[PDB]
Design a protein around this ligand. Structure first.
Ligand SMILES: *B(O)c1cc(Br)cc(N2CCCC2)c1
Length: 566
C-alpha cells in the first residue's frame, strides 16, 4: 500500500501510544486466576468512561522451539503477581501496511475487560475472536478497543491464537504429532480458560457468548461444532462467516513441503524431514513466503489461503476437526444454543484492492465457471455441466452483458458469505434442538467513522457497506474519534453493542429499550421458512425479507442434480 498511508499509519501509531498513556489511571488492581494472580489497571475512553484492563494473560505455554506447530500446552503456574498492565505481541504475520513481517511466536494471550471488578451480580461474558483469514489479526486495543462495550455492565474478553503456517501446518504422518489446526486448539484452550476464570473478574460462567467476524466467525462456528467445547458457552454470533465458507477450510497436508522448499529445504518430500526443516526456520521467513505457496491452479479454483483449518488426518487427544465441517454439523452440540448470524449489505466490496491489481479477474464472469463450488466443478472446469452451473452464477450476478467490477464484487458477496450461510442454516435445521437462530443484515454506511480494514481494501471515498465495516461500531480502533452523541454513527454504536449485549444476556436480540427498535418484531428463522427474514440495520432498524434471497436460491439450483452435496 502507498507510502502515504504508511506515513499516516506511523503517525496514527504515534498518536495511539501517547493517547494510550493518557487514558491510563494510576489505579492498579489485582485479580486471582487459577494460574496465579494478575495485575490489571483502569483505563479511560474518549467518551470519559472507564474500565479495568487486564492484558497479556497466558492461557497456554509459548508455542516456541519444540512446541511450534504442536497443539497448545497448559501454561506454567506462578506464585506472586504477574504483570498484566500491558499487551503482549501479536501472532507472527505480514503487516498489510508495512509489507513486513511483524509479531511473535510468543502470542498466546487473552485480554479481559470490565467496568466493575466487584459487580452486584454476575455479568454476561462476551468472548471475541478476531478475523483476518487466519493469517492476520490482533487483540491489541489499537484495533479491538473494548471502549464501546464496557459502557454496559458486561465482561469482554479478546483472545489471540496462532496464525498462518505456524497455526495451521498439517502433516499426514501420525508419528510427528502435527495433525493441524493448532490455531483452533489455541482457541479451545482459551475458552476452557475463560469458563474456569471469568467468575474471578465478575463474569457468570454459566452465561458465556462467543462471537467473531470473518475468520473469527468461522472460528466461533468451529468452537460450536467441535466436541472439545461442548457446554463451554451458551450463545453464538457468527458475523460474516462460518465453518463451511469455502475460504474457512483447506486440505493443506501437501503444502508443508512447498513452504519448506520456498524456505530452501534441500531434500525429498518426507513429512519427517520437512518438519525437521520447518522446525528450525526463522518464523518471519516462513510467514513471509507463505504468500507464494498456493499454485496457479489453486488460485484459479479460489483457494484463498495455503494454510488454514483442516480435517485432521488422524485423531489425537486434542483433535478438533475429525471430519469435514459439513459433516460435524450432524452432531454439533452448538446446533442447540441460541445463534445469531449476519452479513453486511455489500460484503464483496472487500475485494476492491485485489480487483484493482488484477482487473482480468472480471473476465472470469464471462462463464463464471471458476466460481462453481469446487465439489461440483471438474478439475479443468471444462465439463459441460460446469459451464451450465456457471451460467446459473452468471444469470444471478451479471447484469449487463459485459460483466463489471461491481458484478464481480457482488458475486463475491455470495460465494464467500451468503451461500455458505444458506447451506449452514438448511443443514443445521435437519439436526437441531429447535433452538432459535436469528439473522441480521448490517446496512449502515458512513465515512465519518472508519477502521483500518477500509484502508486495506482501498475503500477511501468508496460507498457501500463492505465486509468488516461493522467492526467500527463495536470496537475502538486507532483511526476512530469521539462522535457527537446525537450523530448517526454514535447511535449505531449504542444499537450494535446494545443488541449484541441483549442477545448475549438473554439469547434473544430484541429489546424495546434499544432506540429505533420499538416497531421491530424480530423472529428467528424456522425450518418451514421459504424466505429468510432479517433485522436490516441501517439508519432505520427494519425487519425485511433478505434481499439476497433470489440470488441465494439461484446458487442453490446448481445443486439440482446433486442434492446430497448441498
Ligand atoms: B475474514 O477473516 C476474511 C475473509 C476473507 Br474471504 C478474506 C480475508 N482476507 C483476505 C486477505 C487478508 C484478509 C479475511
Amino acid at each position: 500500500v502507498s507510502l502515504m498511508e504508511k506515513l499516516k499509519w506511523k503517525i496514527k501509531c504515534i498518536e495511539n501510544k501517547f493517547l494510550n498513556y493518557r487514558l491510563t489511571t494510576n489505579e492498579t488492581v489485582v485479580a486471582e486466576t487459577e494460574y496465579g494472580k494478575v495485575k490489571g489497571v483502569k483505563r479511560l475512553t474518549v467518551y470519559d468512561d472507564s474500565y479495568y484492563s487486564f492484558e497479556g494473560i497466558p492461557y497456554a505455554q509459548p508455542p516456541v522451539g519444540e512446541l511450534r506447530f504442536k497443539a497448545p500446552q497448559r501454561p506454567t503456574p506462578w506464585a506472586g503477581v504477574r504483570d498484566c498492565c500491558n499487551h503482549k505481541d501479536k501472532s507472527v504475520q505480514v503487516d498489510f501496511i508495512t509489507g513486513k513481517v511483524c509479531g511473535s511466536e510468543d502470542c498466546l494471550y487473552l485480554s479481559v475487560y470490565t467496568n466493575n471488578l466487584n459487580p452486584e451480580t454476575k455479568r454476561p461474558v462476551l468472548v471475541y475472536i478476531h478475523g483476518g483469514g487466519f493469517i492476520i489479526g490482533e487483540n491489541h486495543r489499537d484495533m479491538y478497543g473494548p471502549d464501546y462495550f464496557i459502557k454496559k455492565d458486561v465482561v469482554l474478553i479478546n483472545i489471540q491464537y496462532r496464525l498462518g503456517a505456524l497455526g495451521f501446518l498439517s502433516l499426514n504422518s501420525e508419528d510427528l504429532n502435527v495433525p493441524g489446526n493448532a490455531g483452533l486448539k489455541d482457541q479451545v484452550m482459551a475458552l476452557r480458560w475463560i469458563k474456569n476464570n471469568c467468575a474471578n473478574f465478575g463474569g457468570n460462567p454459566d452465561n458465556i457468548t462467543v462471537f467473531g467476524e470473518s475468520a473469527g466467525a468461522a472460528s466461533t462456528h468451529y468452537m460450536m461444532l467441535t466436541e472439545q467445547t461442548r457446554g463451554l458457552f451458551h450463545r453464538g454470533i457468527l458475523m460474516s462467516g462460518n465453518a463451511i465458507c469455502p475460504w474457512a477450510n483447506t486440505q493443506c497436508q501437501h503444502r508443508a513441503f512447498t513452504l519448506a522448499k520456498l524456505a530452501g529445504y534441500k531434500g525429498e518430500d518426507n513429512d519427517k524431514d520437512v518438519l525437521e526443516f520447518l522446525m528450525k526456520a526463522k518464523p518471519q521467513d516462513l510467514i513471509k513466503l507463505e504468500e507464494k505457496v498456493l499454485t496457479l491452479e489453486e488460485r484459479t479454483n479460489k483457494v484463498m489461503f495455503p494454510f488454514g483449518p483442516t480435517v485432521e488426518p488422524y485423531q489425537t487427544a486434542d483433535c478438533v476437526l475429525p471430519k469435514h465441517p459439513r459433516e460435524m454439523v450432524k452432531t454439533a452440540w452448538g446446533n442447540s444454543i441460541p445463534t445469531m448470524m449476519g452479513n453486511t449489505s455489500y460484503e464483496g466490496l472487500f475485494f476492491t484492492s485485489i480487483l484493482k491489481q488484477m482487473p482480468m479477474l472480471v473476465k472470469e464472469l464471462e462463464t463464471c465457471v471458476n466460481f462453481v463450488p469446487s465439489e461440483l466443478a471438474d478439475a479443468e472446469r471444462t465439463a459441460p455441466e460446469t459451464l451450465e452451473m456457471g451460467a446459473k452464477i452468471k444469470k444471478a450476478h451479471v447484469t449487463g452483458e459485459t460483466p463489471t467490477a461491481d458484478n464481480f464484487m457482488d458475486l463475491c458477496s455470495h460465494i464467500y458469505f451468503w451461500f455458505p450461510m444458506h447451506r449452514l442454516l438448511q443443514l443445521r435445521f435437519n439436526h437441531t434442538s429447535g433452538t432459535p437462530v436469528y439473522l441480521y443484515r448490517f446496512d449502515f454506511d458512513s465515512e465519518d467513522l472508519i477502521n483500518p480494514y477500509r484502508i486495506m481494501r482501498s475503500g477511501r471515498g468508496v460507498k457501500g457497506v463492505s465486509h468488516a465495516d461493522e467492526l467500527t461500531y463495536f470496537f475502538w480502533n486507532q483511526l476512530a474519534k469521539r462522535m457527537p452523541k446525537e450523530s448517526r454513527e454514535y447511535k449505531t454504536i449504542e444499537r450494535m453493542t446494545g443488541i449484541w449485549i441483549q442477545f448475549a444476556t438473554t439469547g434473544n436480540p430484541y429489546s424495546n429499550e434499544i432506540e429505533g427498535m420499538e416497531n421491530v418484531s424480530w423472529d428467528p428463522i424456522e425450518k418451514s421458512d421459504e424466505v429468510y427474514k432479517c433485522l436490516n440495520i441501517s439508519d432505520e432498524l427494519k425487519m425485511i425479507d433478505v434481499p439476497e434471497m433470489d440470488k441465494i436460491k439461484q446458487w442453490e439450483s446448481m445443486f439440482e442434480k446433486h442434492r446430497d452435496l448441498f
